[PDB]
Ligand binder design. Structure first.
Ligand SMILES: [Zn+2]
Length: 215
């Protein structure tokens, strides 16, 4: 007997997955959607624990805006709402070098898609952490009302991105990518946070106080 509340994925709080020792699991339980088919508990647990490093207030903002992060075992291009992407080149890549079938995450909308097993840099993407980076796009556009376009953030990007991402074209030259990757550096580990602080101290302070910038 399979309920329709699980047919298209399972909200984490309804999944039976044990997350009682994860910080902010009461909020993440209403944001994260896990697969309704077999999946790796280790991969989901690591992803959710990385998301749990985020300031609780920001997670509450995401939940109150009804942003969801759906963890997939399948490619994004098997989801009906992404099926038009099958076999197509993603913008910014040379055709033949990449297809959307190989892109493991998409952020920006109220539904963030993250394929499990692809978190680390180079696994189909160039971010230090796929789930933080993709979620940050949705935070940027929805919670923070395109904060990467503000005068203050634009000035931080101009002054500090050349110091932090001199060799990483997308993060250097796209303000929304600079925002999302700076967010990931702040939250993925103490080491990456201190790297951000040393190379881009005003950006570090901006991310640190991000929760006070919502709309
Ligand atoms: Zn991105």
């Amino acid at each position: 007997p399979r309920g329709s509340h699980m047919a298209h994925g399972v909200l984490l709080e309804e999944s039976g997955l044990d997350v009682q020792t994860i910080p902010s699991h009461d909020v993440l339980g209403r944001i994260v959607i896990v697969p309704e088919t077999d999946f790796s508990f280790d991969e989901a647990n690591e992803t959710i624990r990385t998301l749990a490093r985020i300031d609780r207030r920001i997670l509450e903002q995401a939940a109150n805006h009804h942003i969801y992060i759906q963890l997939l075992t399948n490619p994004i291009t098997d989801e009906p709402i992404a099926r038009h992407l099958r076999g197509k080149t993603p913008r910014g890549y040379v055709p033949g070098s990449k297809t959307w079938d190989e892109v493991p995450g998409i952020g920006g909308a109220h539904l963030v898609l993250v394929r499990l097993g692809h978190s680390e840099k180079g696994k189909g993407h160039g971010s230090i952490n796929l789930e933080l980076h993709a979620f940050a796009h949705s935070l940027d556009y929805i919670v923070f009302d395109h904060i990467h376009e503000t005068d203050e953030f634009q000035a931080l990007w101009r002054e500090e991105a050349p110091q932090l991402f001199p060799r990483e074209y997308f993060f250097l030259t796209y303000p929304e990518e600079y925002f999302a990757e700076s967010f990931a550096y702040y939250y993925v580990s103490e080491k990456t946070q201190e790297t951000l602080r040393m190379a881009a101290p005003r950006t570090y302070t901006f991310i640190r106080q991000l929760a006070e910038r919502a709309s």
